[PDB]
Each structure stands twice: as C-alpha cells, then as structure tokens.
UniProtKB/Swiss-Prot annotation:
Protein's name in the database: 4-coumarate--CoA ligase 2
Keywords tagged on the record: ATP-binding, Ligase, Magnesium, Nucleotide-binding, Phenylpropanoid metabolism
Record: residues binding (E)-caffeoyl-AMP: Y232, S236, A302, G325, T329, M337, D413, R428, K430, K434
Residues where (E)-4-coumaroyl-AMP binds: Y232, S236, A302, G325, T329, M337, D413, R428, K430, K434
Length: 529
C-alpha cells in the first residue's frame, strides 16, 4: 500500500469549477480602487478596476483579431502590464497563452510558436526580427507593445476594443488556459497544459482558507522581479496576488540598486525570490545602506537554497518570515509551501522546502523497487491532486510516462518527509539542470552537440556553482581525427542558445559512461565532477 502524506492544514472548499479570471477577480468589489499593478519602469499604477477593464478590452480586441476559444497566443514580453492584460484577456475568450523568454534566440522562439500553434505573437519592436519571416510565411499576427514595424500591429488595437464585444463563451473546468514549456523528467521542452481547474486549485491551495498556507492580503505590496513567463511568478505572484487584492510591483530585470530602492521606497512586504537573488542580498556592500524592514515574508523557490544563505537573509530582513516553496511546472506548480508563511504560522526547520499543499496527496517512492516509503526515508517525490497539469500538448506518450493512471505525478526529485511533515529535497533523479532557477534541458544541448560533424557523442550534466547553483557542462567524445577545442565547442553552442543554456566547461573523454542498456550514467558523471 502507498504511504500517503498530507498537509498539516485542513482541506478547504475550492471553487475550481470557475474560470480563472472569474476566480481571481471573485472578490474584486472589495478592492476595486486599490493599486493592482505598479510598473517599476515608469511608475505607472493600474488599479484592480483598471486591470479587469483592460483585460476585458484586450479580450474583445483579441476576438476581433481572430482568437476563438481554444486558440493560442504567444506572449513574448518582459514583466509588464501588457503581459497581464494579454494573459487574462485570452482567459476571458477561453483561449490559451503560451509564454516565452523575450531573450530566446529566433530558433528557440519559432520552435515554441510552431509547437504551440500560436496565432498571434505579442512582443516588443526590438524582437520582431526573431519571428518576422516565420510569421509572414504562416500568417501569424505580430502585435508590438511599443512601436509597430511594417506588417505589425500596435497593442493599442487591442486596448481600443469595446469590452462589451466579448463573445458569449462556455469555458469548461478542464479547458487549457496556460501553456508554459518544460522538459519534465526527460527529453526536450514540451507544452504543459495548465487548465482553469488546475490553476484555480493551485492558487486556492496557497492563498485561500481560514488559515492560508501563504498569507497575502489586500494591503501587501508584492515584488514581481521573477519572470512572468515562468510558472513561479505567473502563479505565486500574479495569480495569487490578484486573488487577494495585493499590489504587484513589476520589475523588468533584476538590478541590485533598483531592487533595493523599490523595496525601501514602496515598502515591499512580500519578497518572492530565487537563490541567486538571496545570494546578491547576502553579498552586496550597498545592502547595509537600505531599510528593508518592511518585508514580512521572504520566499525562495525554483532551486536549492541551503543553510549559509538562509542565515544572512534573516539578518538582512529582520522582520521577515523566511522559507521556501517547491514547485514544478507540471505540478501546477506548487507541491509544497513553507507553513511559516501561514496566517497562523507553524514552526519550520532550515533547509526544508515546505509542507505538501492542502487538498493534495504526496508519496515518496523508491526508484529501484517502486515501494512507497515511510517518514525519514529518501525517494522520488510524487504528488496527486486537481492542481496538476492536464498533460503535455500533443504528447500522450510523455504524459503517460509522467502521470500514472492513479493520478500520481512523478517529479524526478529525491527527498524525504520528517516527523513534523516537512519536506526536504536531497537530490535530483531527472536530468534537468537549473541555472539560476531557469530550466536547462540537457537533451536539447546534446542534440546540438551530436549534430556537430566533429563530435561523436556527448552528455550534458550539472556542475555545482556558487553564483548559478548549477551550470551546464558537457562531456564530449571527439570524432576520429577531430581537434575541436573547449572554446570551439562552447562557441558552437553559444551561437545557437539563450545565454543561460551555454556550456561553461567541456570535458573531453574517450567514451560517455553508459549503463549496459546505453543510457547515460548521469549520476556517475556528476560524481566525477
Ligand atoms: N525549493 C526547491 N528546492 C530545490 N529544488 C527546487 C525547489 N523548487 C524547485 N526546485 C527544482 O526545480 C524543478 C521544477 O522546475 P520548474 O522550472 O518546472 O518549476 C519551478 O522551479 C517552480 C518553482 C516554484 C517555487 C515556488 O516557491 C512557488 O511558489 C512556485 C513555483 C523541481 O522539480 C526541482 O528540481
Ligand atoms: Mg463553465
């Protein structure tokens, strides 16, 4: 029998039959006049009323541009009010938003645009070159938020639309609303189908209930420095923030001076961070010149944090509850959330990534035997609940390998739960690399390397790194007679991928360590490092 773990919080009612926009704005009349989005770039503020209205106008505009229920738009933007209006606008139509890093290479963007069947790409003028040819050849509309080059529309064409022209629509709970890309537990990036039901469940798991797991309210100011095109910020910052009526302070990029100035100036109360930001706070000489006493909650997620950094956060944020959250795109994303963040807080331990969310079930499974394990024994973390993905777009085979027929999502993460129901992640079974919290899929890089006429075989694995947590390193077997150097390999990759996917070291070997079956012995390679 499976040994099942649950939250220390009781199950709650979740209205996951509601469309995401209906749920997120359910209580809007209570904070209609309150600030919703604060743009750190220009200090423009939009109220809740504004955000709901603009989203509805954008929905009408998108419909006029040809977006029907179940159609897809691609958002190719930095953190911005426009990102938000496009995302919520598509939700109103029963449509889907796929989101991507605006700094992706042309090849990377086009691959995702093709895979997702995006009908419209929303971007900035400076990135039109990345998609122009593809979009013209395929009649994909390009909408720019700043200035429209030839053959593009301005975002104003969406906001000019009348909110009363939103068509009648019957959105179902299992309808897809968000399509972030993730490589999951093996292979290439795949389209993660996140539904209305799923996202409502995940948000509720965090912020709803008499004692919410992550207590945020309508007087909080939450920093949005994490990218909205990734699921952490999208769900835990934007969607959770909207649900409770919090102010969301948008930053387009991390800059230490801007970051500190904004926290001090706006009296930021919620800090959703990743370990590299925590590291910058611990290391920077200018931090001592700032008043960060306003921050009451500091969360780190997306990558391991560790004891040394956890300590200096305490010092630099004297009034904050500090802890971690643990998410995975396929999981909706949140699996576990620090209970020190609760309205009535629980005691926590350093290095824990939280307690499994309420209205969910967790088990720990030995990868060798398939046996579910008791407390204080490490194995693969698995989760079940309404919050998880519907599956991978156009990939039933990968879905079947990732979520079993009893509804269990296998994360590829190794951990244990202790006597206080605190989850600790100790290792990663899956091949995924995390550079500053960003996914790096080795399979993508390995495919590129194997394509080089002077490379016979290759394996990409994480190497531990202070600044980035992990960096991608390549083990390369040269073809016979090949003289390709470390820099030549690095350059070959650097010309084809976004910066964070770059190979930082190349180790040349006679053979890639493989199992008898020929699967890369990644654990063996990590051990060599
Ligand atoms: N706290 C963590 N400690 C160690 N590893 C972590 C942690 N969080 C994520 N990971 C590793 O990243 C993988 C998922 O990559 P992904 O890029 O799919 O997803 C994320 O990272 C999302 C993390 C979130 C964190 C929050 O606190 C939150 O509120 C909402 C989301 C996952 O399978 C782990 O290997
Ligand atoms: Mg319905």
């Amino acid at each position: 029998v499976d040994i099942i773990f649950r939250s220390k919080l009781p199950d709650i009612y979740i209205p996951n039959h509601l469309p995401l926009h209906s749920y997120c704005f359910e209580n809007i009349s209570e904070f209609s006049s309150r600030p919703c989005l604060i743009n750190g770039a220009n200090k423009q503020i939009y109220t809740y009323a504004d955000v709901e209205l603009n989203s509805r106008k954008v929905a009408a505009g998108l419909h006029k541009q040809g977006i029907q229920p179940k159609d897809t738009i691609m958002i190719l933007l930095p953190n911005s009010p426009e990102f938000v209006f496009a995302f919520i606008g598509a939700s109103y139509l029963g449509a889907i938003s796929t989101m991507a890093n605006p700094l992706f290479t042309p090849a990377e963007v086009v691959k995702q645009a093709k895979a997702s069947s995006a009908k419209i790409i929303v971007t900035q003028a400076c990135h039109v070159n990345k998609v122009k040819d593809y979009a013209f050849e395929n009649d994909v509309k390009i909408i720019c938020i700043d200035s429209a080059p030839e053959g593009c529309l301005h975002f104003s064409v969406l906001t000019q639309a009348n909110e009363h022209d939103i068509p009648e629509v019957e959105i179902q709970p299992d309808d897809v609303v968000a399509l972030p890309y993730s490589s999951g537990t093996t292979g290439l990036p795949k389209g993660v189908m996140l539904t209305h039901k799923g996202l409502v469940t995940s948000v509720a798991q965090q912020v709803d209930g008499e004692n919410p797991n992550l207590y945020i309210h309508s007087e909080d100011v939450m920093l949005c420095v994490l990218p909205l095109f990734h699921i952490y910020s999208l769900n835990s910052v934007l969607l959770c923030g909207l649900r409770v009526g919090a102010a969301i302070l948008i930053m387009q990029k991390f800059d230490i001076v801007s970051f500190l100035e904004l926290i001090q100036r706006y009296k930021v109360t919620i800090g959703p961070f990743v370990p590299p930001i925590v590291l910058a706070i611990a290391k920077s000489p200018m931090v001592d010149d700032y008043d960060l006493s306003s921050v009451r909650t500091v969360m780190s997620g997306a990558a391991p944090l560790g004891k040394e950094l956890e300590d200096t956060v305490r010092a630099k944020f004297p009034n904050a509850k500090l802890g971690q959250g643990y998410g995975m795109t396929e999981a909706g994303p949140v699996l576990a959330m620090c209970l020190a963040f609760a309205k009535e807080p629980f005691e926590i331990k350093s290095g824990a990534c939280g307690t499994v969310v309420r209205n969910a079930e967790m088990k720990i499974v030995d990868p060798k035997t398939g046996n579910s394990l008791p407390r204080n024994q490490s194995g693969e973390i698995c989760i079940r609940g309404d919050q998880i993905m519907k599956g991978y777009l156009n990939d039933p085979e990968a879905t079947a390998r990732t979520i079993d027929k009893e509804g269990w999502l296998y994360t590829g993460d190794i951990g244990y739960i202790d006597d206080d129901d605190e989850l600790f992640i100790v290792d990663r079974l899956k091949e995924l690399i995390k550079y500053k919290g960003f996914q790096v899929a080795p399979a993508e890089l390995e495919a590129l390397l194997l394509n080089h006429p002077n490379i016979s075989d290759a394996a990409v694995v994480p190497m531990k790194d202070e600044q980035a947590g992990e960096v991608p390193v390549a083990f390369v077997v040269r073809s016979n007679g090949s003289t390709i150097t470390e820099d030549e390999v690095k350059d070959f990759i650097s010309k084809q991928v976004i910066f964070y996917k770059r190979i930082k070291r190349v180790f040349f070997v006679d053979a890639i360590p493989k199992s008898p079956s020929g699967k890369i012995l990644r654990k063996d390679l990590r051990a060599k490092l």
